[PDB]
Design a protein around this ligand. Structure first.
Ligand SMILES: Nc1ncnc2c1ncn2[C@@H]1O[C@H](COP(=O)(O)OP(=O)(O)OP(O)(O)=S)[C@@H](O)[C@H]1O
Ligand SMILES: [Mg+2]
Lengths: 319, 258, 169, 254, 258
């Protein structure tokens, strides 16, 4: 081996706002903005792998044309983004003179805005306020609550949502048509099921299954990829009889190499996000999952502790 | 346009050393009779004001004044390439986004050129200098530096008191008190060491030691320092240049005011 | 509730140029002193007389700002009495508006006797946003503006940014 | 065994000053024709390579090569006892657990002797030097240091560009941009100040300023520095010694 | 009362440099035959003892001994005003609450005067010096400093071993071991570089390197250092002054004792 090929997430990364199968409303909004111009300060929030960075990249590219190289300032979490950088480099870029069309503006893209320190975020306020006629700011984050309210007050808020089954299925069908891959309906269904609204993870699993077996079938997808860890945990907690839950925990989780910490933590998440049972029984199950945890963290993490946690949860559900 | 060539990059480097630390933003303006620059610290108790006449340069051309603001720190960062003996030329167009510093050695050999990004500052030069001050005195600047360096250790406030034929610097704090008393005198063996004093009215003002410490830097530009004090305005500490001067105006402490 | 906005609008409506000072941020009354004295006694380059607006005066942990205002008031009372009773001093010719959240703050006890006290009770934001909508030619239903005010919790900056984002769409 | 006596402890101290900071572990090997040493930084972008021939020593004896690895920091900590004028003798047996540094003054008087613990490093000396480089240039090392010290302030990257009869160093960052342009020239009034350049092909490479800053230290070992650049390999910056040389190979950016 | 004038403020500044860092409180006592001072560190392993005879001063007057204690840090903070060439006069009444340091230049010109607050310390001067020590040696103090600076890097303990005609300093720690061996010798080309040794009994003591490092400061007061060692008491390192001496008594490590 001498060199590798580009992954399908990067190779087929959308370069035009029409290729994005994300939230239709915000996509058409950004398309009309790039068509008319006058892009305002924006903050795009959501979950990983739904088309946030690609969306702002496509918007900046379409809005700047060939001037993207000298009119767009990209700053990721991999670069220093402290108070000194905001004071010197961002201010020098915002004060920089640049002849642009009468409908465009310089764009400052800040990826992972939820990781910037409080001082830099505070200094960015007047930085974006005094140069709001020749410099525009686009933040891309996962938690909008991590950005201070003064910064959110000077910008639009775009909350991206999970991708429905239809959109990811359409994108995967387009990728298969562009790549000439042998597939089947159940295989694509299993891929979308294991993706959980994550387009990047879906394309990655598809490419991995293709390069590992060639045929995208549910058997191959399940043998190479793991059935959503949370679903087996939910089926274990929602069991009606103790022996069924014990057998599930033994075979599916413990005999496959899942650590006790992952089991208990996944267990907590499933419960917190549960809606089948009432609030009080959910709180009692969370209490039992957490007292056990307190023992799991102390190094007493074994199968007996999880079995006792399940027994206590069933006793709580035993009226 | 801006086109000013200093014989020795060293002069400009020492001038900027004077603005250094005590101010962040400086507003320069070149014109037909030279270059001026003003910088005010954040608390607004210190104003640094420069004037360099046409004759201080080896070559100066100006057919159209240009005003330009910049970050002092950025400027000094770049101001250590002068080799001191290098030639320095400041260059800028009539509507600049940058200021070009061009250092060249006598021979064509090595040419260090910088393009510093400018800041937009609302042009608002102050003209706070007074016609007459209560008292005026000059003395060797190295002596003034020592006086300031002594007292500084004792307090954050240094008082300057002037009475007929007497100048007294005083500091009083936790560990105790100190004072330096100097008297006017003409030394013919070399008058650059004399201490002159013209008092129209006794004065007694207090200044924040941190600021006087910033001001003493001017010693590197002139052998003597002129100090003009008034109960009506900021004090003036001045360091003369060949065709020019560097001035520091410092507001007296009200009771607590630097 | 719009204390700052009402002070600004009424001062501008009366033909004054408004100069705002945040009293909580200015931790140098004795220095600020020069700013306040220049703003009260020097002619501005503007054709319009200056009105001083001091915001958050209850946040000044150091009585410097309030002592300066009291000293200015006492100096003007002494200067006026000299004009009335003096047989043959900078007079205050400019209005001062101060804004606090708490009236019974210990720092304000010395200032209260010189002040005309006005209580602003808990609509004004809706009126302002409607005026912005009308000037930007945006036909927004009053219901959606109320829902935006409720979303923004009475933050005027957040309201205007959300309105600007609705306009771009 | 290892038995190498330096006339002046100062030479060894300056040599080690060159490895200092930029590398942590150094692998020395003494043999019949002298001593060599190699050290690679953690990111593997810089290789420091030394060669000291037999003639650089006042006394050198080797009937059996010895390879020894050590922590650079530990070595420098001990490398300030040379009085510079002291005599320094490096000593080690054929299967050493330590390296002995022996500093002695002319008279029997004072003898400072150290026994430094060694580290085991898999012997794997690199031989990445090229036959021909795109361009070759030499200039006073103090001049090169100034050039690097200037530009460093502006950016974390300094570009070196070579065209016929022109060498240009450039940095461009937040506060602005800078450049230093030098031209080849023979100074007969003293040729140690000349600037030579042999260009077979124009080159244009970018280096991390932090590394060039580590490299300039070699000025203390030689009046001139040789710089060899290629688009096919790490650049070579070389500082000649009397019988020997200190070389820094630096991988260009992307 | 206290009235001691040093010709050069520098001598006093170097003396205090010796107490500096290693001790916090110093107890001075002036009397008819001079000034003495003692300071003990918190762990009580080091005693710094000073003696300045009447002849070391340009002017000394004492008709009534005065004992005064003070914070060393406060004193040094004030001890950088001497210009080294300035004249220094220590002044105090018979029941002082402060100590006055008066620095004056030859001419009436500048007078820096300090009033240092005193601390109350129970007078309890130690007299731990021995009649005879196991071994005695002197050598250039710069040489002793180098020896200490070498070994210090290797360990927190430096051992001094003495046998007939042999003095050996040794340190052994993590990175390895080191040793410095010196031999007695008379250099007529200048005897201030000689290394004398009188051994009545071989000695072998260990000291905490941090303390020896504090002690080497005395090099600035004398060309040579005298080291007296005993297995019965703290070691004595002595730096002679013109009419006086600065002594450091250091307790050997028991196995772990500085
Ligand atoms: N709507 C979409 N249409 C097509 N491909 C998409 C879409 N969303 C994501 N992708 C793919 O996922 C890759 C990565 O998308 P990103 O925008 O980087 O994910 P993200 O939404 O920004 O979440 P992060 O970066 O983890 S916070 C892209 O290069 C595409 O290949
Ligand atoms: Mg992203």
């Amino acid at each position: 081996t001498l060199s590798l090929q580009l992954p399908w997430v990067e190779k087929y990364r959308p370069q035009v706002l029409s290729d994005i199968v994300g939230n239709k409303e915000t996509i058409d909004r950004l398309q009309q903005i790039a068509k008319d111009g006058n892009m305002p300060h924006m903050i795009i929030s959501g979950m990983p792998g739904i088309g946030k960075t690609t969306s702002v990249h496509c918007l900046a590219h379409e809005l700047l044309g060939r001037s993207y190289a000298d009119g767009v300032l990209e700053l990721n979490a991999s670069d220093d983004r402290g108070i000194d950088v905001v004071r010197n480099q961002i201010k020098h870029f915002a004060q920089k003179k640049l002849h642009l069309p009468p409908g465009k503006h310089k764009i400052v893209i800040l990826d992972e805005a939820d990781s910037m320190t409080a001082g830099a975020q505070q200094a960015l306020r007047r930085t974006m306020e005094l140069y709001s006629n020749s410099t525009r700011f686009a933040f891309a984050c996962n938690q909008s609550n991590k950005i201070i309210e003064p910064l959110q007050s000077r910008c639009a808020i775009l909350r991206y949502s999970k991708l429905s089954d239809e959109d990811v299925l359409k994108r995967l069908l387009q990728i298969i048509k562009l790549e000439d891959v042998k597939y089947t309906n159940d295989g694509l269904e299993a891929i979308i099921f294991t993706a959980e609204g994550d387009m990047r993870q879906a394309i990655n699993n598809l490419q991995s299954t293709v390069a590992g077996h060639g045929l995208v079938n549910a058997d191959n997808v399940f043998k190479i990829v793991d059935s959503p860890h949370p679903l087996i945990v939910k089926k274990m907690l929602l069991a009606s009889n103790l022996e069924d839950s014990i057998q599930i925990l033994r075979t599916d989780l413990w005999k496959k190499g899942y650590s006790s910490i992952d089991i208990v933590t996944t267990s907590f998440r499933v419960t917190k996000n549960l809606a089948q049972v009432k609030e009080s029984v959910r709180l009692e199950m969370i209490k039992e999952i957490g007292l056990t945890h307190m023992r799991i963290l102390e190094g007493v993490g074994t199968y007996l502790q999880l079995a006792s946690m399940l027994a206590k949860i069933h006793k709580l559900n035993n009226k | 346009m801006l086109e000013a060539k200093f014989e020795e990059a060293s002069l400009f480097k020492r001038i900027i050393d004077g603005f250094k630390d005590c101010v962040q933003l400086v507003n320069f303006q070149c014109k037909e009779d030279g270059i001026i620059a003003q910088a005010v610290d954040d608390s607004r108790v210190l104003l640094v004001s420069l004037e360099i006449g046409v004759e201080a340069f080896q070559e100066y051309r100006c057919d159209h004044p240009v005003t330009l603001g910049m970050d002092l720190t950025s400027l000094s960062k770049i101001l250590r390439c002068g080799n001191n003996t290098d030639t320095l030329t400041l260059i800028a167009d009539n509507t600049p986004d940058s200021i070009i510093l061009l250092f060249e050695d006598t021979k064509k050999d090595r040419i260090a050129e910088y393009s510093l990004k400018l800041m937009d500052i609302d042009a608002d030069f102050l003209k706070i200098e007074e016609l007459q001050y209560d008292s005026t005195l000059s003395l060797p600047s190295s002596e003034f530096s020592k006086i300031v360096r002594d007292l500084s250790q004792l307090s954050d406030s240094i008082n300057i008191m002037i009475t007929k034929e007497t100048i007294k610097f005083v500091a009083d704090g936790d560990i105790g008190s100190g004072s330096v008393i100097i008297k006017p005198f003409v030394d013919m063996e070399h008058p650059e060491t004399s201490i002159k004093l013209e008092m129209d009215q006794p004065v007694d003002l207090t200044f924040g030691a941190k600021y006087l410490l910033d001001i003493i830097k001017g010693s590197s530009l002139s052998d003597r320092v002129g100090i003009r004090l008034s109960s009506e305005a900021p004090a003036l500490f001045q360091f003369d240049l060949k065709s020019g001067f560097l001035q520091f105006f410092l507001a007296p402490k009200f009771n607590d005011e630097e | 509730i719009g204390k700052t906005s009402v002070a600004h609008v009424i001062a501008k409506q009366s033909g004054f140029s408004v100069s705002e000072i945040n009293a909580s941020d200015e931790r140098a009354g004795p220095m600020v002193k020069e700013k306040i004295y220049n703003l009260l006694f020097n002619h501005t380059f503007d054709t319009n007389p200056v009105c001083l607006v001091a915001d958050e005066i209850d946040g000044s942990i150091e009585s410097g700002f309030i002592r300066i205002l009291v000293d200015i008031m006492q100096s003007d009372i002494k200067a006026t009495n000299k004009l009335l009773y003096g047989q043959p001093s900078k007079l205050l010719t400019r209005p001062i508006i101060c804004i606090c959240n708490n009236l019974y703050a210990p720092s304000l006890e010395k200032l209260k006797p010189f002040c005309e006290i006005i209580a602003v009770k808990r609509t004004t934001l809706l009126e302002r946003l409607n005026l912005i909508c009308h000037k930007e030619n945006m036909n927004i239903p009053i219901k959606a503006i109320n829902d935006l005010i409720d979303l923004a919790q009475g933050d005027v900056r957040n309201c205007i940014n959300n309105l600007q984002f609705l306009a771009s769409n």
